[PDB]
Amino acid sequence: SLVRLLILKFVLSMSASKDVLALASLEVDLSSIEPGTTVTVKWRGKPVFIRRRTEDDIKLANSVDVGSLRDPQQDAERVKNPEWLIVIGVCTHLGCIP
Amino acid sequence: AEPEMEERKLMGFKWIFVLTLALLQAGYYRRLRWSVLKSRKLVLDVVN
Amino acid sequence: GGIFEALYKVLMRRNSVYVTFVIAGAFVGERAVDYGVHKLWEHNNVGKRYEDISVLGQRQ
Amino acid sequence: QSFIDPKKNWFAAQHMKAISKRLRRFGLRYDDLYDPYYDLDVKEALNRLPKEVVDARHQRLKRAMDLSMKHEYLPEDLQAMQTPFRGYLQEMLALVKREKAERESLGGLPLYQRTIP
Amino acid sequence: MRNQRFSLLKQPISSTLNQHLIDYPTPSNLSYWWGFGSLAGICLVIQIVTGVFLAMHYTPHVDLAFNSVEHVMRDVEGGWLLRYMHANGASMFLIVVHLHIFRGLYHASYSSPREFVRCLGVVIFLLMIVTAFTGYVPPWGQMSFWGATVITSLASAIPVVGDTIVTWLWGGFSVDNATLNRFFSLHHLLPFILVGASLLHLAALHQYGSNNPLGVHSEMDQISFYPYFYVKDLVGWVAFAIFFSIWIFYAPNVLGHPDNYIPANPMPTPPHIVPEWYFLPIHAILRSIPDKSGGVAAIAPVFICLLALPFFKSMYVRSSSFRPIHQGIFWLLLADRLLLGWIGCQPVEAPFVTIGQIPPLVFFLFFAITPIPGRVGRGIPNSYTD
Amino acid sequence: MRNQRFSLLKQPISSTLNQHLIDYPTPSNLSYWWGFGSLAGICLVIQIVTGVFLAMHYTPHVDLAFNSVEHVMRDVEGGWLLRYMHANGASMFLIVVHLHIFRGLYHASYSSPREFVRCLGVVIFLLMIVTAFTGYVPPWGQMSFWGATVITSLASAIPVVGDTIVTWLWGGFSVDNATLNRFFSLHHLLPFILVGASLLHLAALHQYGSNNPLGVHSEMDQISFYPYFYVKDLVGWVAFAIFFSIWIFYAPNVLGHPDNYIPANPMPTPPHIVPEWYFLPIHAILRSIPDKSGGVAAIAPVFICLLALPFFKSMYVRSSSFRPIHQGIFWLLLADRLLLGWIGCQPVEAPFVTIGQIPPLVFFLFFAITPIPGRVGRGIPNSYT
Amino acid sequence: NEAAARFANGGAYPPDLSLITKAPHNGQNYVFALLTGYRDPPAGVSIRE
Amino acid sequence: EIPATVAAVKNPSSKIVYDEHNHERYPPGDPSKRAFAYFVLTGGRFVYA
Amino acid sequence: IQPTDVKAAAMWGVAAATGGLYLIQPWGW
Amino acid sequence: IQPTDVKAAAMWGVAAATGGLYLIQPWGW
Amino acid sequence: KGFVPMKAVTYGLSPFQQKIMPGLWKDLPTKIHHKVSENWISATLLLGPLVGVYSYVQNYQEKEKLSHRY
Amino acid sequence: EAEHGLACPSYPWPHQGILSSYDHASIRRGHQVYTQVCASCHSMSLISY
Ligand code: HEM
Ligand code: HEM
Ligand code: HEM
Ligand code: HEM
Ligand SMILES: COC(=O)N(OC)c1ccccc1COc1ccn(-c2ccc(Cl)cc2)n1
Ligand SMILES: COC(=O)N(OC)c1ccccc1COc1ccn(-c2ccc(Cl)cc2)n1
Ligand code: FES
């Protein structure tokens, strides 16, 4: 039990602090741009991506094979608007902003 | 960007020159300690 | 060849004099080479030093 | 098998004379490359051999470590007198290994073991 | 013992230094390829002494770290020499160890009875990689941020405890001041583990001695270490200090990236993220797999097939001087580790996706076509016999 | 060697651990006073492990150092345990080593053939003092500033160079951010020199073995270290961890000063500048001389008369059990090192100027009245016969 | 600050020039050729306002 | 046929031949180059100081 | 004895004139 | 004999699982 | 551990009876021809696959650059 | 082809060489180009007076 207490106390102090967890949820605003361009604004420590894509982009966009996707899901559920797309700007692959 | 470039090129000429003199001393010192081995004669008995 | 026996004649049959010659010979040699680098430098660069500025004293 | 015999194959009769050329310049035989520190069975095959056969091996190995320190080869008089591939070790080493495969199928502790480093 | 004294080097206070550094018996035909091991122990002492003086002027804080490195370069007496010796000195420590490893593959130095000497050195190569990576973050430039992001997020493809690994390594939700402060504490500690693992790696070689360029039993012609292999190691420490002085005084920024002179900005990405030259071969294998969880699982079989070389047996000839076929495979592997380093600094596009998938296959066919000469080769004395 | 293998502990991979930690021959009558040496090697490992985790959250800057220590105490998971183990753990490392040293003076363990074991341990005591002093500055409170000022300016009384020594140690004209940054770099380095000097100090004892409570030649009755002196050393590591846990959980600030909770201000002076309890005897000798250059020259003869104990010879009896007069001088020196510690936390006034000048004299009369029993005592077998 | 610097320049930030010859590749021939390199666009390229 | 190492202990000849592939010898009747060998080893011990 | 005296003195005048040879530095001579 | 060697030896694999979740409770996997 | 019983006769000269330096620039044309007529299949295996791959990449990149131009 | 830029040529700067120095009268003139044309929108912030 003494080896149990010590090893857990040294490894749990590396996890995350009470002041880092206090900055984990909040509310911020954006501004306007024209259809098809890019501008980002910051939330906690990372960006918020951006698209309002045009009428030529209603094609080459969503009617591509659903069985050729690494994970298959409709475009209609990731969008909440018929032409806008703005979602947290970090790639799910390796944490890089593309 | 580089305010040290003149203090740097003058220190590097002094010590590359001085170190190519210690390389000529150390190749003489090496070939002097190894000359009794490199010229010895040895007879052994075996043929093939 | 007579300078070679005569230079060993006087100094190193001893081991404290010898340490004088390698310490004190490290100085005359370090000043003989610092002098020649400091005169090949100001001969490749004429007209480029700080004291060769024609408007040095006068900013106003 | 069928790809290693040099009197049937052509690319094994050129691998054979490449090692034969390189052994003659140091005056070594192919069995002198067998180390009693690599394989503990090679240490036993050399203790069962006559003293005059092991002594000629130790003198061929000293002549060759002397030629590679000096960066030279045997002179060409002595290179025509060399016999690589004339063996002294392969038959005694097969006998020691055959006796060890019999002591294991029948139970029985090994006669010599390797030290753990 | 004896009844009264004799030479003072044979006294107990200096016996471990006498019998292991002065009177130690050495094969007499060792070449200059046996000189890169003491050269690597000098490169480790240079990094410790230079880094202890660099840490008296460095501040591990995200608001103060980039400006502490420019304060050393500009306001500290001789401080530009202290930094350039340390940044370029980590490139000299990797050139010397890479030429050390390729000696041991040519002369088959991993073989019996020297398996523990090989396996203690694969652990040393792993501690060197972690130390150089974790220390490249303290300057806190644009390549010190976007290189710690690309590597620490690669542990998020491990099954389903791996999302709890990355946020425990980071100390938060991204790379930030909790990550820069703990990368500094581990960087003072890991060079001192590297010292104790190098003295242990040398006690394993002084149990059987050294190998030689002929590969044979060598106990009939052996001389002592002093003065014979001390004065030819001294020719190597002076030829090294000339080569090291053309990187400090005349080209101190050739071996780096310009992007580490921009302070770290997490909103834009640099156009191309390339590591230092000595991480380029494992960076091209890691990007060659089109799945990410299979990319971490191609780095661990690099360190598994290295750790499992000395345990295949049937090979009585050691040196590549007498082995004409395995000698031609050595020069064909060295051409592949230099082609994998070229690929690792190119864009991920055509044609570098095919030329970066075949050399990871050829690199892993070296460790499977070694033991097949351990079978076909042991029937040579029964065929070539005269 | 043998022809095939046997017990695996007698293999080369574990010979140095077998013959020095398991099968090593030990005198059979060793008491519990021979237990404080492995206890001091555990206190050194606790300080290294706790400090490596403390340095992942500390910032060595004068604007950020005091607030990094309160961030550990308040926002890091279990961080108050990491600090209290490290601050109180430096007091446990000095209690254990002080009881170690007084064992070696009672049983005369410095004597032949064990002179190199004594002299390697005086070097260890010097590396422990520099490490604890240099580490008491990183919290950057009012006693971390006015203690580094009182000690580093004491080198300004060394002849002609002097004032060039102090401005090179400081990095400027006062104690400031150049001094706090270089005190942090040396503090990560000096515990790892202390490790290599402790393994060297143990190779010198395994050349002749250990002394015993009777002081005699002991090679006719000796047992092995495992299991006999391992299981009675384990009784000592559990009695220690109880005593160490009443300083972390129930009294974590008794052994410190309150003034180190005020952030450092170089304009006012605290009313009384007192060090930690384990520096109080050498602080009373240093303030006992009314000249300052003769104060630095009374600290260096403390470490000279320590390093020159094992080189007086004529003493064939070792243990104080059979020596009734030198035994009474041992208990009269221990009463003086506890009276010099009391004086070192008092004001510099009457009557503590006379009671602080006589115990520095009595402390130096212990190392001059040892060798005179090395002369009068060797004529005992020709008189009492 | 950096926010007031982008506002007076159309969103774009003009960098710090104390290390600008070390921060791009070929950094001395690049700053010379950029400042004396403003030309007229080729046929087919359009630029924003 | 006598062994070569046996026929060398029985014939102490005063005409000895060494190996002359790497070093040539000074012919017998020349002084020793000990003083020259000291002065080359001093000008490098200047440098290490 | 008496050689080791003077032979203590010759290199005792080396330190003196070897640390009088690394810090204060009249350098023309 | 030799069966009872392994018929013992695979329950220390499991004495070690009573031990492997004893302190860490590795949860997601 | 280190003993091989042996039988040999060795002769040796003194260091200060020989010529130390001149055996370096002795027959350097003959020394060069020996190294390059014996190590020419180990350099055709080291530079060969690198010159041939660099030729492929420069030809691939000079035909997708002239296919994007209008 | 316009994604990384055009490649700049190589100019013989007066401080390029193994024994070449800075032209100090050209540093003097370049501080005057900076302080009148450049300092209105660029900072240095590492260089003191
Ligand atoms: C900090 C890094 C290292 C240090 C200080 C070091 C030190 C040494 C030294 C001093 C030798 C003495 C003989 C010689 O120089 O050849 C040696 C031999 C050896 N080293 Fe290393 N080494 C290091 C890294 C490595 C690595 C990375 C490997 C292999 C993966 C390795 C494998 C070997 C082998 C196999 C030998 C013996 C070869 C022979 O004797 O023929 N070492 N090492
Ligand atoms: C006790 C040992 C060491 C200490 C205290 C230390 C300290 C430091 C410090 C303070 C820095 C930041 C200053 C700077 O950026 O130049 C740094 C950077 C660095 N360190 Fe170390 N170091 C140590 C050993 C090593 C070793 C052994 C290696 C490599 C094997 C290494 C590799 C690096 C590298 C690559 C950098 C990056 C420097 C740059 O690219 O600008 N360090 N080190
Ligand atoms: C590698 C070894 C060590 C490291 C990295 C280390 C690190 C640190 C750090 C970061 C601090 C400042 C945080 C704080 O104030 O609590 C500190 C303080 C301190 N250290 Fe260490 N330490 C080490 C070993 C030691 C040792 C061996 C000793 C004593 C012999 C020691 C004595 C102290 C003391 C007395 C303090 C003052 C703490 C206080 O009073 O608040 N340290 N150390
Ligand atoms: C980091 C601090 C120290 C460590 C780890 C250490 C370690 C040890 C150990 C493990 C022993 C053997 C066990 C024992 O006899 O209790 C020992 C014995 C000894 N130590 Fe220490 N020690 C340290 C400090 C000191 C100091 C400060 C001194 C003296 C000024 C010293 C002098 C001695 C002596 C004289 C022995 C004699 C053994 C005997 O009397 O039988 N040590 N040390
Ligand atoms: C000196 O460091 C760099 O060059 N770094 O790091 C900031 C860099 C910079 C830019 C891009 C990539 C890197 C890192 O490249 C690699 C490639 C493989 N590893 C690696 C690292 C640790 C371990 Cl355990 C295993 C593999 N790292
Ligand atoms: C834990 O540190 C303290 O208690 N410190 O230091 C901030 C302190 C605090 C207030 C007052 C005095 C001190 C120091 O007291 C002493 C007394 C003697 N030494 C000493 C130090 C180093 C050397 Cl080499 C030799 C002698 N130090
Ligand atoms: S998001 Fe695509 S790689 Fe990081």
Side-chain angles (χ1 to χ4, degrees):
Chain A
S1 277
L2 288 171
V3 171
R4 208 205 107 178
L5 182 85
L6 287 175
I7 285 175
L8 270 189
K9 279 265 160 41
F10 282 113
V11 75
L12 279 197
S13 72
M14 294 183 51
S15 43
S17 192
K18 295 179 181 65
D19 52 281
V20 186
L21 301 176
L23 297 184
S25 285
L26 204 138
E27 198 83 33
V28 284
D29 285 40
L30 293 109
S31 63
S32 173
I33 51 165
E34 318 255 53
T37 326
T38 297
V39 65
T40 19
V41 80
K42 186 258 192 182
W43 170 49
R44 54 170 156 208
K46 352 166 205 329
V48 169
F49 260 175
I50 174 118
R51 182 64 58 184
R52 49 178 293 163
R53 74 273 203 194
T54 186
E55 288 83 4
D56 219 345
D57 273 334
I58 291 179
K59 169 67 187 78
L60 1 111
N62 87 331
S63 327
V64 279
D65 202 0
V66 296
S68 76
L69 296 175
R70 184 174 171 88
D71 178 73
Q73 186 167 53
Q74 56 173 345
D75 192 286
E77 186 64 29
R78 26 187 39 76
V79 302
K80 318 296 177 206
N81 308 39
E83 290 99 342
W84 264 86
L85 267 167
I86 159 172
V87 289
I88 325 265
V90 168
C91 187
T92 322
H93 188 223
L94 280 180
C96 313
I97 302 167
Chain B
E2 312 186 351
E4 80 269 345
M5 180 213 81
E6 294 185 358
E7 197 211 327
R8 187 177 93 223
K9 291 180 173 186
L10 275 163
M11 199 188 294
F13 202 94
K14 183 185 173 181
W15 293 112
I16 293 187
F17 176 79
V18 153
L19 274 170
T20 61
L21 299 184
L23 186 71
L24 293 186
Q25 181 259 12
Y28 178 83
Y29 191 29
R30 192 257 166 193
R31 284 179 67 86
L32 181 76
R33 295 286 179 256
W34 272 81
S35 51
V36 195
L37 287 160
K38 279 268 204 314
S39 42
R40 75 181 172 177
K41 193 203 183 167
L42 176 76
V43 303
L44 265 171
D45 281 330
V46 70
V47 171
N48 57 345
Chain C
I3 63 171
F4 272 90
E5 39 72 13
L7 262 61
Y8 187 51
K9 175 188 174 186
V10 284
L11 182 142
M12 37 156 145
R13 357 238 196 105
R14 323 167 121 84
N15 255 143
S16 21
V17 179
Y18 186 68
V19 210
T20 292
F21 194 55
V22 300
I23 293 284
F27 170 95
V28 194
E30 194 234 352
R31 187 96 190 114
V33 67
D34 189 288
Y35 179 88
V37 177
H38 272 336
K39 282 245 185 7
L40 199 69
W41 180 267
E42 6 166 13
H43 181 77
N44 209 25
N45 317 301
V46 285
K48 295 210 288 174
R49 308 175 301 152
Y50 156 75
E51 293 88 297
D52 291 272
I53 295 174
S54 5
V55 285
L56 193 58
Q58 356 220 2
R59 184 184 178 257
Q60 319 304 135
Chain D
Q1 293 297 106
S2 64
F3 290 157
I4 204 176
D5 173 81
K7 33 180 64 65
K8 288 167 67 176
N9 206 342
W10 190 90
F11 299 97
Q14 311 289 130
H15 187 248
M16 184 190 162
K17 80 185 284 290
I19 316 187
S20 176
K21 178 184 178 181
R22 296 170 190 208
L23 281 173
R24 287 184 190 266
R25 307 182 310 202
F26 289 90
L28 286 167
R29 290 187 180 169
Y30 193 88
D31 307 58
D32 295 305
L33 308 177
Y34 279 58
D35 204 354
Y37 283 96
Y38 174 73
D39 188 25
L40 223 56
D41 284 8
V42 180
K43 190 178 169 163
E44 200 62 35
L46 292 165
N47 295 10
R48 302 177 172 192
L49 286 180
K51 187 186 182 296
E52 293 85 5
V53 175
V54 188
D55 280 7
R57 162 202 172 93
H58 291 335
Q59 288 166 14
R60 276 189 308 257
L61 283 177
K62 198 206 168 67
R63 182 176 60 167
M65 273 191 78
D66 187 68
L67 286 172
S68 67
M69 183 208 56
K70 292 172 178 187
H71 301 121
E72 52 188 88
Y73 298 141
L74 273 188
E76 188 157 307
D77 347 307
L78 287 181
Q79 278 190 24
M81 298 188 209
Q82 301 310 305
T83 71
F85 304 129
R86 173 180 296 183
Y88 62 92
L89 186 55
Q90 293 309 309
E91 286 85 5
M92 187 66 78
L93 179 66
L95 173 85
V96 175
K97 286 189 177 303
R98 199 192 46 86
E99 291 179 0
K100 202 182 65 171
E102 185 193 1
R103 212 192 165 90
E104 277 162 3
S105 71
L106 208 57
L109 301 186
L111 288 171
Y112 37 81
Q113 297 180 3
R114 178 180 170 175
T115 313
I116 302 304
Chain E
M1 29 283 356
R2 280 196 196 279
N3 208 3
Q4 75 187 350
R5 269 123 76 202
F6 276 95
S7 179
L8 201 151
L9 295 192
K10 294 226 280 180
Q11 293 309 288
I13 202 169
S14 63
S15 69
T16 309
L17 294 124
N18 182 80
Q19 77 200 357
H20 292 306
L21 290 170
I22 296 164
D23 269 278
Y24 192 69
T26 324
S28 72
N29 63 330
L30 298 191
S31 59
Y32 271 112
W33 289 107
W34 268 259
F36 291 111
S38 56
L39 208 56
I42 291 170
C43 285
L44 173 66
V45 171
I46 290 172
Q47 291 299 91
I48 292 187
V49 173
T50 303
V52 163
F53 283 100
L54 269 182
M56 296 170 172
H57 311 274
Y58 169 76
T59 306
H61 200 283
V62 284
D63 291 318
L64 301 173
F66 193 91
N67 292 336
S68 277
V69 188
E70 300 304 317
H71 164 82
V72 165
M73 295 284 290
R74 283 160 191 271
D75 294 320
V76 184
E77 275 301 307
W80 59 266
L81 190 65
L82 267 190
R83 180 169 185 262
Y84 281 150
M85 273 174 81
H86 204 77
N88 286 288
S91 298
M92 316 302 294
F93 188 32
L94 271 292
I95 292 172
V96 162
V97 172
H98 272 145
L99 300 165
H100 200 46
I101 292 172
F102 275 89
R103 193 271 324 255
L105 294 176
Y106 189 89
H107 294 292
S109 283
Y110 43 83
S111 282
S112 301
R114 288 170 197 107
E115 290 98 2
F116 198 42
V117 188
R118 179 74 174 192
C119 292
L120 267 173
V122 178
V123 181
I124 285 174
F125 192 53
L126 187 71
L127 280 172
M128 284 173 62
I129 286 177
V130 180
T131 312
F133 165 82
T134 281
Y136 194 72
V137 184
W140 204 244
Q142 273 281 81
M143 200 58 73
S144 298
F145 184 80
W146 291 100
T149 294
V150 110
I151 291 302
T152 54
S153 284
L154 199 69
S156 299
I158 296 176
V160 67
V161 270
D163 186 46
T164 36
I165 297 170
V166 63
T167 59
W168 170 90
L169 183 60
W170 281 347
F173 309 113
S174 179
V175 193
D176 211 56
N177 190 67
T179 318
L180 181 74
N181 215 330
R182 69 185 60 185
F183 274 12
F184 179 71
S185 184
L186 289 171
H187 193 55
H188 219 297
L189 172 77
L190 289 189
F192 286 103
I193 293 172
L194 206 39
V195 163
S198 283
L199 304 171
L200 203 65
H201 163 85
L202 284 180
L205 195 76
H206 282 191
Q207 196 205 5
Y208 292 109
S210 166
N211 200 20
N212 59 81
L214 286 183
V216 298
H217 185 234
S218 76
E219 293 180 357
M220 66 290 305
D221 205 351
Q222 282 186 335
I223 62 190
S224 61
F225 188 77
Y226 186 76
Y228 296 103
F229 292 108
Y230 161 77
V231 300
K232 90 180 292 201
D233 274 14
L234 167 76
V235 189
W237 306 337
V238 184
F240 172 75
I242 295 173
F243 185 73
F244 190 31
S245 295
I246 320 167
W247 291 118
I248 297 169
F249 297 117
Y250 286 108
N253 295 299
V254 164
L255 290 174
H257 310 110
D259 305 87
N260 222 12
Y261 284 111
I262 318 171
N265 200 353
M267 314 288 143
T269 308
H272 297 292
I273 303 181
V274 177
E276 287 292 320
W277 68 267
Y278 45 84
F279 282 165
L280 289 187
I282 62 179
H283 185 74
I285 286 173
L286 192 48
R287 299 185 325 171
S288 181
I289 313 296
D291 171 44
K292 187 170 77 77
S293 64
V296 166
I299 303 302
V302 167
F303 286 84
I304 276 172
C305 308
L306 274 170
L307 210 65
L309 262 171
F311 294 111
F312 309 135
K313 38 215 162 227
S314 184
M315 285 178 182
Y316 295 93
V317 190
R318 275 197 194 98
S319 178
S320 298
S321 315
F322 302 108
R323 306 221 263 159
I325 280 183
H326 174 270
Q327 201 190 36
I329 289 171
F330 179 80
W331 295 109
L332 207 63
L333 165 85
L334 186 71
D336 205 49
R337 190 169 172 85
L338 299 180
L339 178 58
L340 273 178
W342 187 56
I343 291 302
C345 66
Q346 295 294 317
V348 182
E349 62 177 358
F352 308 111
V353 289
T354 300
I355 324 168
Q357 272 172 346
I358 307 165
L361 160 78
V362 183
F363 183 80
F364 283 125
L365 290 180
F366 175 79
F367 305 99
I369 312 300
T370 47
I372 300 172
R375 291 292 176 269
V376 192
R378 69 176 178 183
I380 278 175
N382 303 107
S383 309
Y384 290 167
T385 176
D386 295 354
Chain F
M1 29 283 356
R2 280 196 197 279
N3 208 3
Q4 75 187 350
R5 297 199 289 265
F6 276 95
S7 179
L8 201 151
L9 295 192
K10 294 226 280 180
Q11 293 309 288
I13 202 169
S14 63
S15 69
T16 309
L17 294 124
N18 182 80
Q19 77 200 357
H20 292 306
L21 290 170
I22 296 164
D23 269 278
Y24 192 69
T26 324
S28 72
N29 63 330
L30 298 191
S31 59
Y32 271 112
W33 289 107
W34 268 259
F36 291 111
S38 56
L39 208 56
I42 291 170
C43 285
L44 173 66
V45 171
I46 290 172
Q47 291 299 91
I48 292 187
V49 173
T50 303
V52 163
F53 283 100
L54 269 182
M56 297 170 172
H57 311 274
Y58 169 76
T59 306
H61 200 283
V62 284
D63 291 318
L64 301 173
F66 193 91
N67 291 336
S68 277
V69 188
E70 300 304 318
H71 164 82
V72 165
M73 295 284 290
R74 283 160 192 271
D75 294 320
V76 184
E77 275 301 307
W80 59 266
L81 190 65
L82 267 190
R83 180 169 185 262
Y84 281 150
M85 273 174 81
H86 204 77
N88 286 288
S91 298
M92 316 302 294
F93 188 32
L94 271 292
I95 292 172
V96 162
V97 171
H98 272 145
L99 300 165
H100 200 46
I101 292 172
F102 275 89
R103 193 271 324 255
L105 294 176
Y106 189 89
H107 294 293
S109 283
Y110 43 82
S111 282
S112 301
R114 288 170 197 107
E115 290 98 2
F116 198 42
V117 188
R118 179 74 174 192
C119 292
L120 267 173
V122 178
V123 181
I124 284 174
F125 192 53
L126 187 71
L127 280 172
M128 284 173 62
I129 286 177
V130 180
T131 312
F133 165 82
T134 281
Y136 194 72
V137 184
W140 204 244
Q142 273 281 81
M143 200 58 73
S144 298
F145 184 80
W146 291 100
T149 293
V150 110
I151 291 302
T152 54
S153 284
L154 199 69
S156 299
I158 291 156
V160 48
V161 290
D163 285 327
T164 51
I165 297 170
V166 63
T167 59
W168 170 90
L169 183 60
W170 281 348
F173 309 113
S174 179
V175 193
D176 211 56
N177 190 67
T179 318
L180 181 74
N181 215 330
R182 69 185 60 185
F183 274 12
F184 179 71
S185 184
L186 289 171
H187 193 55
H188 219 297
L189 172 77
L190 289 189
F192 286 103
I193 293 172
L194 206 39
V195 163
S198 283
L199 304 171
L200 203 66
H201 163 85
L202 284 180
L205 195 76
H206 282 191
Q207 196 205 5
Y208 292 109
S210 165
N211 200 20
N212 59 81
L214 286 183
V216 298
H217 185 234
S218 76
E219 293 180 357
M220 66 291 305
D221 205 351
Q222 282 186 335
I223 62 190
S224 61
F225 188 77
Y226 186 76
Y228 296 103
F229 292 108
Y230 161 77
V231 300
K232 90 180 292 201
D233 274 14
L234 167 76
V235 189
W237 306 337
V238 184
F240 172 75
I242 295 173
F243 185 73
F244 190 31
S245 295
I246 321 167
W247 291 118
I248 297 169
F249 297 117
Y250 286 108
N253 295 299
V254 164
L255 290 174
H257 310 110
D259 305 87
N260 222 12
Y261 284 111
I262 318 171
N265 200 353
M267 314 288 143
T269 308
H272 297 292
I273 303 181
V274 177
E276 287 292 320
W277 68 267
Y278 45 84
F279 282 165
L280 289 187
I282 62 179
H283 186 74
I285 286 173
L286 192 48
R287 299 185 325 171
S288 181
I289 312 296
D291 171 44
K292 187 170 77 77
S293 64
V296 166
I299 303 302
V302 167
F303 286 84
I304 276 172
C305 309
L306 274 170
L307 210 65
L309 262 171
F311 294 111
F312 309 135
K313 38 215 162 227
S314 184
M315 284 178 182
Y316 294 93
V317 190
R318 275 197 194 98
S319 178
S320 298
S321 315
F322 302 108
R323 307 221 262 159
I325 280 183
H326 174 270
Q327 201 190 36
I329 289 171
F330 179 80
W331 295 109
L332 207 63
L333 165 85
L334 187 72
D336 205 49
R337 190 169 172 86
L338 299 180
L339 178 58
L340 273 178
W342 187 56
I343 291 302
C345 66
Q346 295 294 317
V348 182
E349 62 177 358
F352 308 111
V353 288
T354 300
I355 324 168
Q357 272 172 346
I358 307 165
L361 160 78
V362 183
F363 183 80
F364 284 125
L365 290 180
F366 175 79
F367 305 99
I369 312 300
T370 47
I372 300 172
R375 291 292 176 269
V376 192
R378 69 176 178 183
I380 278 175
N382 303 107
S383 309
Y384 290 167
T385 176
Chain G
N1 42 17
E2 193 213 23
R6 310 186 104 102
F7 183 67
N9 278 112
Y13 177 61
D16 189 284
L17 293 194
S18 44
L19 297 157
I20 206 68
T21 51
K22 286 214 270 201
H25 165 250
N26 206 5
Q28 288 172 3
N29 300 341
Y30 168 76
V31 184
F32 184 80
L34 173 87
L35 299 170
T36 69
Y38 282 89
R39 270 143 175 87
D40 303 317
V45 192
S46 70
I47 317 296
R48 289 190 276 209
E49 187 50 53
Chain H
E1 183 70 11
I2 309 284
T5 46
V6 171
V9 193
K10 304 172 112 77
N11 292 290
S13 60
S14 80
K15 289 185 183 138
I16 307 174
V17 282
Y18 298 105
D19 204 352
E20 293 200 39
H21 169 48
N22 306 281
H23 295 94
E24 202 206 350
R25 72 173 294 178
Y26 282 130
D30 285 334
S32 292
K33 300 294 178 290
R34 181 48 156 160
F36 188 87
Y38 269 153
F39 294 142
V40 187
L41 295 201
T42 49
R45 285 193 281 263
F46 287 172
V47 179
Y48 306 133
Chain I
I1 285 94
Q2 256 129 110
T4 239
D5 247 75
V6 160
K7 275 341 138 329
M11 22 91 122
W12 256 159
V14 110
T18 265
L21 246 240
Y22 165 103
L23 174 87
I24 289 213
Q25 301 221 51
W27 79 347
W29 192 74
Chain J
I1 285 94
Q2 256 129 110
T4 239
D5 247 75
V6 174
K7 283 358 180 233
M11 358 171 177
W12 40 246
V14 86
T18 268
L21 19 124
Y22 158 64
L23 53 148
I24 307 99
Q25 344 234 311
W27 61 304
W29 192 74
Chain K
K1 58 181 182 297
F3 199 63
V4 175
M6 208 64 201
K7 178 175 168 64
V9 176
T10 81
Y11 308 86
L13 207 44
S14 173
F16 320 102
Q17 290 286 119
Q18 324 177 234
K19 303 169 194 197
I20 294 311
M21 272 293 134
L24 284 180
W25 50 87
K26 227 185 194 187
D27 262 351
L28 282 174
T30 307
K31 296 297 293 180
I32 277 160
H33 198 100
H34 178 225
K35 285 177 171 70
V36 81
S37 310
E38 293 204 350
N39 296 324
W40 74 270
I41 324 198
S42 99
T44 323
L45 286 173
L46 173 63
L47 308 170
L50 265 62
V51 166
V53 159
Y54 200 76
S55 176
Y56 173 71
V57 179
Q58 295 279 138
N59 192 36
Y60 186 81
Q61 285 179 337
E62 204 183 0
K63 301 217 185 142
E64 268 190 276
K65 197 195 76 177
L66 265 347
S67 66
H68 281 132
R69 289 183 171 192
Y70 302 93
Chain L
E1 282 179 52
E3 286 77 58
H4 295 305
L6 189 51
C8 49
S10 277
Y11 303 106
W13 295 95
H15 48 276
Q16 284 196 338
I18 67 162
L19 284 164
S20 289
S21 83
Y22 287 125
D23 193 6
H24 281 239
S26 174
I27 302 178
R28 163 76 173 254
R29 271 181 270 139
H31 180 258
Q32 197 178 325
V33 186
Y34 164 73
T35 195
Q36 294 170 12
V37 190
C38 190
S40 65
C41 286
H42 271 281
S43 136
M44 303 284 264
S45 76
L46 286 177
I47 292 99
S48 296
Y49 276 107

